[PDB]
Design an enzyme around this catalytic site. Structure first.
Site, mmCIF file in Angstrom:
data_model
loop_
_atom_site.group_PDB
_atom_site.id
_atom_site.type_symbol
_atom_site.label_atom_id
_atom_site.label_comp_id
_atom_site.label_asym_id
_atom_site.label_seq_id
_atom_site.Cartn_x
_atom_site.Cartn_y
_atom_site.Cartn_z
ATOM 1 N N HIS B 40 -30.546 32.922 34.336
ATOM 2 C CA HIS B 40 -29.517 32.962 35.388
ATOM 3 C C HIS B 40 -30.136 33.237 36.751
ATOM 4 C CE1 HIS B 40 -29.325 37.361 34.437
ATOM 5 N NE2 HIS B 40 -29.163 37.444 35.745
ATOM 6 N N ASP B 84 -30.974 33.698 27.528
ATOM 7 C CA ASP B 84 -31.135 33.961 28.949
ATOM 8 C C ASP B 84 -32.594 34.263 29.229
ATOM 9 O OD1 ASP B 84 -30.506 34.356 31.602
ATOM 10 O OD2 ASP B 84 -29.574 36.321 31.303
ATOM 11 N N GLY B 174 -29.514 43.033 40.975
ATOM 12 C CA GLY B 174 -30.799 42.963 41.645
ATOM 13 C C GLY B 174 -31.938 43.253 40.675
ATOM 14 N N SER B 176 -31.914 41.925 37.421
ATOM 15 C CA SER B 176 -32.000 40.773 36.519
ATOM 16 C C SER B 176 -33.379 40.159 36.459
ATOM 17 C CB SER B 176 -31.037 39.695 36.954
ATOM 18 O OG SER B 176 -29.779 39.805 36.327
ATOM 19 N N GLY B 177 -33.796 39.791 35.251
ATOM 20 C CA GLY B 177 -35.092 39.172 35.058
ATOM 21 C C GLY B 177 -36.234 40.140 34.948
#
Ligand SMILES: [Ca+2]
Lengths: 56, 222
Positions: B40, B84, B174, B176-177
């Site tokens: 995402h 994801d 902020g 994410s990942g």
């Protein structure tokens, strides 16, 4: 009218800046979008926002 | 990261910031030329920033390298958030103590394992406050059953929950990942949740141990 809906950040945790039409202010404003499950009042630029929702 | 602490400059050498004019997601360096993050977080024009601590000021240990390729998992589902995961190839190889890669897991981690989650995301549960420096959080992996009771019919075999049921400590927008490292291995990728640091709503992460083969082969053929 999706243009009157409040901005939706969603469940994902990115910090992506998008635009939504703010009918109260009569302008497109920025908000933080999480990266997934976007609603329709969510645009990539102010121009896209104004073209779709401007005047709602 | 809500309820965490300042990691300290370059104490998390594998942490990277994905920048598209501003920080929008985190990621982990798993190879001198490859970064793993969330699907995402896919965006065009990504610049990867390594060796970062204060993301707002150039401190001298940074390496900004743009992405040459961004490969989202072929089965990523934007609706269910299953799979994801995404791989980003750097345009050139990073120069590896302040910048280093993180190892892929040999096996999946068990409930109760303590992990380190890090990022430059929001530090407030009720509010908005983005930090300059990298924040860290130690959180345990939660059992599949409690994860599933927290998010009915939303948890897949490729996701795991981590955090505290009491709330107050969690990843947030902020983050994410970013990495979830346990025992020196990358076990998760910050993915989704319901609000931040809410009671009975732990964060949900991409279960990395399930993609190790896809990762290794994908990196090798690109
Ligand atoms: Ca910096």
């Amino acid at each position: 009218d999706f243009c009157l809906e409040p901005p939706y950040t969603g469940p994902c945790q990115a910090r992506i800046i998008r635009y939504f039409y703010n009918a109260k202010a009569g302008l497109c404003q920025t908000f933080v979008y999480g990266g997934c499950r976007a609603k329709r009042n969510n645009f990539k630029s102010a121009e896209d926002c104004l073209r779709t929702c401007g005047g709602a | 990261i809500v309820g965490g602490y300042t990691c300290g400059a370059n104490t998390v050498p594998y942490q990277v910031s994905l920048n598209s004019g501003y920080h929008f997601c985190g990621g982990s360096l798993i190879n001198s030329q490859w970064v793993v993050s969330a699907a995402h977080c896919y965006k065009s024009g990504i610049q990867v920033r390594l060796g970062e601590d204060n993301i707002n000021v150039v401190e001298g240990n940074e390496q900004f390298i743009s992405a040459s390729k961004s490969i989202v998992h072929p089965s990523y589902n934007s609706n269910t958030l299953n799979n994801d995961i995404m791989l980003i190839k750097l345009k050139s190889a990073a120069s590896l103590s302040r910048v280093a890669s993180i190892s892929l897991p040999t096996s999946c981690a068990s409930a109760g394992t303590q992990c380190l989650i890090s990022g430059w995301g929001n530090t407030k549960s009720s509010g908005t406050s983005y930090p300059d420096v990298l924040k860290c959080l130690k959180a345990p992996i939660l059992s599949d059953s409690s994860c599933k009771s927290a998010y009915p019919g939303q948890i897949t075999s490729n996701m795991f929950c981590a955090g505290y049921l009491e709330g107050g400590k969690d990843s947030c927008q902020g983050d994410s990942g970013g990495p979830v490292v346990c025992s020196g291995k990358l076990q998760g990728i910050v993915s989704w949740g319901s609000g931040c640091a809410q009671k009975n709503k732990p964060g949900v992460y991409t279960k990395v141990c399930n993609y190790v083969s896809w990762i290794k082969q994908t990196i090798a053929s690109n």
